Every structure is written in structure tokens, then in C-alpha cells.
Amino acid sequence: RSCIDTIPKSRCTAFQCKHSMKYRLSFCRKTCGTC
Ligand SMILES: [Li+]
Ligand SMILES: [Li+]
Ligand SMILES: [Li+]
């Protein structure tokens, strides 16, 4: 599986996924639902 978060997912906060492109696209692609 290629779809992963690159940081601990406890820090892949909904707060960040909603509005930070770096979270959506770099750090939290899985938890934010990009992949
Ligand atoms: Li936890
Ligand atoms: Li963070
Ligand atoms: Li924290």
C-alpha cells in the first residue's frame, strides 16, 4: 500500500486536514483522504 501518512496520525488532526495543504498533500495524505 502506497497511501500512508508520513507523521504520527494522532497529529493528523481534522483541524489541519480541513485547511492546510501541507497536511493534506505531504504529511497526512491517508488520514486527510487525499489517497
Ligand atoms: Li490514539
Ligand atoms: Li503537526
Ligand atoms: Li500534541
UniProtKB/Swiss-Prot annotation:
Its localization reads: Secreted; Nematocyst
According to the record, mutating Y23 to Q/R results in:
More than 25-fold decrease in potency of inhibition of Kv1.3/KCNA3
Tell me yes or no: is Nucleotidyltransferase among this UniProt entry's keywords: no
Give any single GO term for biological process.
defense response to bacterium
Annotated phenotype, changing M21Q = More than 25-fold decrease in potency of inhibition of Kv1.3/KCNA3
Q: Which Gene Ontology CC terms are recorded?
A: extracellular region; nematocyst
Give the consequence of mutating F27 to Q/R: More than 25-fold decrease in potency of inhibition of Kv1.3/KCNA3
What SUPFAM superfamilies does this protein map onto? Answer: Crisp domain-like
Q: Does the keyword Secreted apply?
A: yes
Q: Where is the ShKT domain?
A: 3-35
What molecular function terms (GO) are annotated for this protein? potassium channel regulator activity; toxin activity
- Per the record, where is site Key residue for binding both Kv1.2/KCNA2 and Kv1.3/KCNA3 (occludes the channel pore like a cork in a bottle)? K22
Keywords from UniProt, A to Z, are: Antibiotic, Antimicrobial, Disulfide bond, Ion channel impairing toxin, Nematocyst, Neurotoxin, Pharmaceutical, Potassium channel impairing toxin, Secreted, Toxin, Voltage-gated potassium channel impairing toxin
Q: What is the effect of changing K9Q?
A: 10-fold decrease in potency of inhibition of Kv1.3/KCNA3
Recorded consequence of changing Q16K: 6.6-fold increase in selectivity for Kv1.3/KCNA3 over Kv1.1/KCNA1, which is marked by a 2.6-fold and 117-fold decrease in potency of inhibition of Kv1.3/KCNA3 and Kv1.1/KCNA1, respectively
Do you know which PROSITE patterns this protein is assigned to?
SHKT
Further remarks about this protein from its record: Negative results: does not show or very weak activity on Kv1.5/KCNA5, Kv3.1/KCNC1, and Kv3.4/KCNC4 (IC(50)>100 nM). The synthetic analog ShK-192 has a paraphosphono-Phe (Ppa) at position 0, a Norleucine at position 21, and is amidated. It is stable at acidic pH values and high temperatures. The circulating half-life of the synthetic mutant is estimated to be about 30 minutes in rats. However, low concentrations of functionally active peptide are detected in the blood 72 hours after the injection.
Give the family per the record: Belongs to the sea anemone type 1 potassium channel toxin family. Type 1a subfamily.
Task: Please give the function described in this protein's UniProt entry.
Answer: Peptide with both antimicrobial and neurotoxin activities. Inhibits voltage-dependent potassium channels. Potently blocks Kv1.1/KCNA1 (IC(50)=6.7-87 pM) and Kv1.3/KCNA3 (IC(50)=10-250 pM). Less potently blocks Kv1.4/KCNA4 (IC(50)=0.31 nM), and Kv1.6/KCNA6 (IC(50)=0.16 nM). Shows moderate activity on Kv1.2/KCNA2 (IC(50)=9 nM), Kv1.7/KCNA7 (IC(50)=11.5 nM), and KCa3.1/KCNN4 (Kd=0.03-30 nM). Blocks Kv channels by binding to a shallow vestibule at the outer entrance to the ion conduction pathway and occluding the entrance to the pore.
Q: What name is this protein filed under?
A: Kappa-stichotoxin-She3a
Q: Lineage of the native species?
A: Eukaryota, Metazoa, Cnidaria, Anthozoa, Hexacorallia
